[PDB]
């Protein structure tokens, strides 16, 4: 995952 | 009436058509044995349509 805490990223 | 309005109406009038991608016709090989080839042209048209 993005894991900025998870960044708000749409799962394509 | 002006020619650019005529052009913009040409632009309005055009409709979408489904583009052909790489994996549009791969399944044709799967059903390629013992098929009438007129029905093959029909199937190609369907996937194109």
């Amino acid at each position: 995952g993005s894991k900025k805490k998870w960044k708000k990223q749409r799962k394509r | 009436e002006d020619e650019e309005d005529i052009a913009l109406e040409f632009i309005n009038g055009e409709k979408k058509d489904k583009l052909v991608n790489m994996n549009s016709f791969t399944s044709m090989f799967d059903n390629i044995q013992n098929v009438q080839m007129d029905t093959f042209f029909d199937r190609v048209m369907k996937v194109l349509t």
Partner: protein, 379 residues
């Protein structure tokens, strides 16, 4: 060695060029965009804040920028120098939105409307001749700020006169309609749920007659349609399919804020409707319950901007959450262009986009205050 079935063998033999020339081609190719960059507008005079809003002049070659610097920096865009004709600082008036306006009847009239997180709105006619709209005439409760607004044209049918109207967002589903010049409160439109965005489309009736319809959408995605020529009565109701957390709505293919008209006959109806949202889909509807023609799923963050080309062939959607979250879609094929943007294309955190009324310019502002310009060679 020394019809007609062999026609193909002959025409193939004659030419080694079989691609139809796109110079005659009038709508842009589906997947290839012929785009070339030009120098940024603000190099002459940089902005000290982000570019919250951007607007091209309907006819003159001018570009207007505004932001939290509180200045209306207007630039003469030529594509090679881009000098600053003038600016206008408004102390205590942060700029969230600004726009050009030209009276649809009196072409000589030019005005600038700019607003922010304040209970007043600035008008600048064309020393600076400026006007502050700060009276709502008893509807102060419904409105907390003028920050989000747009300007449209309303035709008074019983007199056949046409004038501008300033549209505002209320606290709870309210939309306040004000007179562009006098500032008088004319009508009000209300919806259920929190108002998130609204947009304007024009439906011509006959020679010299047109009606303005207000398109308003809730975050849940239910869309209302009000007729502003009939005291703002609802005329239609429908829902956006698969719509949740909606953020923006826009129409394209005809007259709008980005592509204003110069005379009544130029009023045209928009054939396209796009609905933005938090998760990043953009449902496109053919205005000609509905069903979306396509559900674009590229940008992975909240849609902060939606805009259609003056001819409605390109839909541009941007997100301020992340950098380079900017895409261009070919219409009606609904296919995103691949060649542009690239990894090396400088966009930053996109916050403002503007299309020139003619000439095929793309202008994009970012959080760093940089308005980068591009040319679409097809136009």
């Amino acid at each position: 060695d020394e019809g007609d079935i062999n026609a193909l063998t002959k025409i193939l033999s004659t030419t080694y060029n079989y691609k139809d020339t796109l110079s005659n081609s009038k709508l842009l190719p589906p997947k290839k965009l012929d785009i070339v960059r030009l120098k940024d507008a603000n190099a002459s005079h940089p902005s000290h804040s982000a570019i919250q809003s951007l607007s091209f002049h309907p006819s003159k070659p001018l570009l207007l920028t505004g932001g939290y610097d509180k200045t209306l920096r207007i630039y003469h865009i030529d594509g090679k120098t881009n000098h600053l004709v003038t600016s206008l600082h408004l102390v205590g008036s942060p700029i969230q939105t600004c726009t050009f306006y030209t009276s649809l009847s009196n072409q000589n009239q030019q005005n600038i409307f700019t607003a922010g997180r304040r209970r007043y709105m600035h008008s600048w006619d064309l020393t600076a001749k400026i006007e502050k709209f700060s009276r709502l005439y008893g509807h102060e409760s419904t409105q907390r700020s003028f920050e989000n607004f747009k300007v449209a044209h309303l035709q008074n049918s019983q007199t056949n006169s046409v004038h501008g109207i300033v549209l505002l967002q209320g606290n709870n589903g309210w939309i306040n309609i004000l007179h562009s010049t006098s500032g008088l409160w004319l009508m009000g439109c209300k919806i259920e749920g929190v108002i998130t965005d609204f947009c304007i489309d024009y439906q011509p009736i006959s020679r010299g007659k047109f009606r303005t319809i207000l398109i308003a959408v809730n975050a849940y995605g239910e869309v209302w349609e009000f007729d502003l020529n009939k005291n703002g009565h609802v005329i239609r109701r429908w829902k956006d399919q698969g719509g949740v957390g909606i953020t923006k709505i826009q129409v394209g293919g005809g007259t709008t804020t980005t592509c204003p008209a110069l005379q009544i006959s130029k009023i045209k109806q928009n054939r396209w409707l796009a609905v933005g949202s938090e998760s990043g889909f953009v449902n496109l509807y053919d205005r000609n319950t509905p069903t979306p023609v396509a559900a674009l799923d590229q940008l992975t963050t909240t849609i902060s901007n939606l805009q259609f080309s003056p001819d409605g062939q390109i839909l541009c959607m941007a997100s301020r959450a992340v950098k380079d979250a900017l895409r261009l879609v070919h219409l009606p094929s609904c296919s995103v262009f691949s060649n542009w943007p690239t990894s090396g294309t400088p966009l930053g955190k996109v916050t403002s986009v503007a299309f020139s009324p003619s000439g095929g310019l793309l202008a994009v502002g970012n959080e760093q205050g940089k308005v980068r310009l591009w040319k679409l060679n097809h136009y």
